[PDB]
């Protein structure tokens, strides 16, 4: 990584990141078999097996109701786009012919590839442990509705084999049929590895995905298809990262203010966030929440981006360039704050706040001067504004400065225009 402090605009640009942009979805359909637990009862009083049976029966009855509400309703920009696409595939699987096709292709094995009538090619996975326990062990050991048995092994196994189902029901009930991420109950780590391998991608994508499973589980999500008898059918959308290895950079900024006897004139760059090259276009993500970092790799969603001209990057070299209208926000009201960057921090200290940088073993290193200061993560461990302490990162990289008088020093605080938000740098002078 390489971070440059831009003194003229109290901003930083950090370069050397590599894109991992989600372009599509790979569908893994699951059939969780619970078994005929509704044809079992415990007429014995309180018991371990009775407790587990009632939990399993109720979880399965609750799932049929979350499914009915979901079906009624279905008949963040990235989250909205993802759900729309998944729900379209879910309506395909919900057809009677597709369910039975999936169940049939899964009668001989626990995993099969299938192409739906919609043309979507999916992986199907059978999860049979709960049904097998209920039919080959529980149904018989409860001979005559007698559940207070002294085996204990049976109760432990029942609890062991049904918790995945219970956790799945909880996630689909708490999220109305659409989980936000992929838990271990929707897809175990072995199942995730099997699906990641089955994807039509490249060996590189497969390694990046298996070395970043937690990121994969956050980018993907799950959708309830429905309850067909004692079989719970749901789908998991796994991300496809079709754009990879392109250059990305992040812009951070803080208010840059000049002052003349209590009157302030302030400048703030309004182009902060992530930028990624994508096939002859630069893609901009204004919400730093839309991208997550793992080393040099930045994971983003192509559906959450905004296209910008490639000349916009020149705002990081000369904000006062005539070749692009660099967007800034101006005003007479200074804001003191800390903007953490990957390899440091911008500190903007104005009016009546106290700013200092500190060390985790020495304490206060120095007081900061008024205005904008750039702190590297090698000069300090913390920055403090009044009572608020900000922890700096420990990421290593090259630090650079592009020296230059702050543009806001040319503004005349005395008689400075009102607050102009999202304007060109020339509109701020007058």
């Amino acid at each position, epitope marked *: 990584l390489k971070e440059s402090y831009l003194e003229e605009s109290c901003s930083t640009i950090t370069e050397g990141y590599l894109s991992v942009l989600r372009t599509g979805w790979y569908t893994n359909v699951f059939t969780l078999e619970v078994g005929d637990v509704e044809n079992l009862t415990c007429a014995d009083g309180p018991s371990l097996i009775k407790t587990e049976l009632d939990l399993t029966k109720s979880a399965l009855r609750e799932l049929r109701t979350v499914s009915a509400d979901q079906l009624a309703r279905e008949e963040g920009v990235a989250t909205a786009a993802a759900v729309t696409a998944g729900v379209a595939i879910a309506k395909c699987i919900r057809l009677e012919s597709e369910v039975t096709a999936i169940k049939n292709a899964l009668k001989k094995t626990n995993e099969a590839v299938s*192409t739906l009538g919609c043309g979507v090619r999916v992986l199907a996975t059978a999860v049979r442990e709960l049904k097998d326990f209920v039919s080959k062990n529980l149904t018989r050991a409860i001979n005559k509705n007698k559940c207070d048995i002294p085996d204990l092994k049976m109760a432990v196994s029942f609890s062991q084999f049904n918790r995945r189902f219970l956790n799945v029901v909880r996630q689909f009930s708490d999220n109305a049929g659409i989980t936000p991420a992929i838990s271990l109950d929707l897809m175990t780590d072995a199942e995730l590895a099997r699906a990641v391998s089955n*994807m*039509p*991608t490249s060996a590189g994508q497969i390694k990046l995905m298996l070395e970043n499973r937690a990121m994969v589980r956050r980018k993907g999500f799950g959708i309830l298809i429905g309850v067909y008898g004692s079989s719970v059918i749901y789908m998991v959308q796994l991300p496809i990262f079709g754009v*990879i290895d392109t250059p990305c950079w992040i812009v951070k900024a803080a208010p840059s203010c000049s002052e003349k006897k209590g009157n302030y004139a302030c400048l703030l760059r309004e182009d902060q966030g992530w930028y990624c*090259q994508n096939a*002859g276009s630069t893609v901009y993500y204004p919400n730093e929440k839309d991208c997550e970092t793992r080393g040099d790799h930045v994971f983003c969603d192509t559906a959450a981006g905004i296209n910008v001209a490639e000349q916009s990057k020149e705002c990081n070299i000369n904000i006062s360039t005539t070749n692009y209208p660099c967007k800034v926000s101006c005003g007479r009201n200074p804001i003191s704050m800390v903007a953490l960057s990957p390899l440091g921090a911008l500190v903007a200290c104005y009016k009546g706040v106290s700013c200092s940088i500190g060390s985790n073993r020495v304490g206060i290193i120095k007081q900061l001067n008024k205005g904008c200061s750039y702190i590297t993560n090698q000069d300090a461990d913390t920055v403090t504004i009044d009572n608020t302490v900000y922890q700096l990162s420990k990421v290593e990289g090259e630090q650079h400065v592009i020296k230059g008088r702050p543009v806001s020093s040319s503004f005349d605080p005395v008689k400075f225009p009102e607050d102009q938000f999202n304007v060109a740098l020339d509109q701020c002078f007058e």
Partner: antibody, heavy 124, light 110 residues
Framework: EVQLVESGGGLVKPGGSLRLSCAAS????????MNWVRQAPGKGLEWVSS????????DYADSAKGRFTISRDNAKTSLFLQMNSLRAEDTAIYFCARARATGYSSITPYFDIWGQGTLVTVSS | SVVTQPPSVSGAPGQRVTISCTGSSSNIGAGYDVHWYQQLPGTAPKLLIY???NRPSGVPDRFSASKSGTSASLAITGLQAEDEADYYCQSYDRSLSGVFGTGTKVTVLG
């Protein structure tokens, strides 16, 4: 204008070495995966090697594994193929091609821009 | 394995002809898509179809294509003299990576 121009083709004896160069212009070179495809006289197209936008990933056909090394320099927007231990069956027109991948249902790269190719002739 | 095409296809001007592309489980059968190129003699291949059935901007509507299971096909509906060329299908293989079909020469019997 989007253009790829290959160079470095010529005659070489079995066991010899050549380095091909592709000059890219008219597009953001560092955004794209790049490929080499070759075509023997009167024969079909044959993929040779690929390199990712920032050289993190590279791949080669079984025939090129060990002997050939792909590389790029995004500063000069140039692609290169270092060919060593060349044999007569490597005689071909070598094309430089820009790759794209929609990544919607799979990652299956297609080649939307091709250079005109340079001839590499391996003969004793 | 290798992706095979018929060596030659021919038709009259105004005829519809098809070009098959026979893949396998490690490529088209593995879920990878199929692209097509047209190559006039002496020139570089030109992208003709991408992602099974989409035409780039400079490709007339008489070209269409599709993919099914482990094979694909390209259709030219109403051959014209300029369509005489070599045509290659293209996919990705789980073990061989980028794979090109063996190629088909189309003759327009004029």
């Amino acid at each position: 204008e989007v253009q790829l121009v290959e160079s470095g083709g010529g005659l070489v004896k079995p066991g010899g070495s050549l380095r091909l160069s592709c000059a890219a212009s008219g597009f953001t070179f560092s955004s794209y995966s790049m490929n080499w495809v070759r075509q023997a006289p009167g024969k079909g197209l044959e993929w040779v090697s690929s390199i990712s936008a920032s050289s993190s990933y590279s791949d080669y056909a079984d025939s090129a594994k060990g002997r050939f090394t792909i590389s790029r320099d995004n500063a000069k927007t140039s692609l290169f193929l270092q060919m060593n231990s060349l044999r007569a069956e490597d005689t071909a027109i070598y094309f430089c091609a820009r790759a794209r991948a929609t990544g919607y249902s799979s990652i299956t790269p297609y080649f939307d821009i091709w250079g005109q190719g340079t001839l590499v002739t391996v003969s004793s | 394995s290798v992706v095979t095409q018929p060596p030659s296809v021919s038709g009259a001007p105004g005829q519809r002809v098809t070009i098959s592309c026979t893949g396998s489980s490690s490529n088209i059968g593995a879920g990878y898509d199929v692209h097509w190129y047209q190559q006039l003699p002496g020139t570089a291949p030109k992208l003709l179809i991408y992602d099974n059935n989409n035409r780039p901007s400079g490709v007339p509507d008489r070209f269409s294509a599709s993919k099914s299971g482990t094979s694909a096909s390209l259709a030219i509906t109403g051959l014209q003299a300029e369509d005489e060329a070599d045509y290659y299908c293209q996919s990705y293989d789980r073990s061989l990576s980028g794979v090109f079909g063996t190629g088909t020469k189309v003759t327009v019997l004029g």
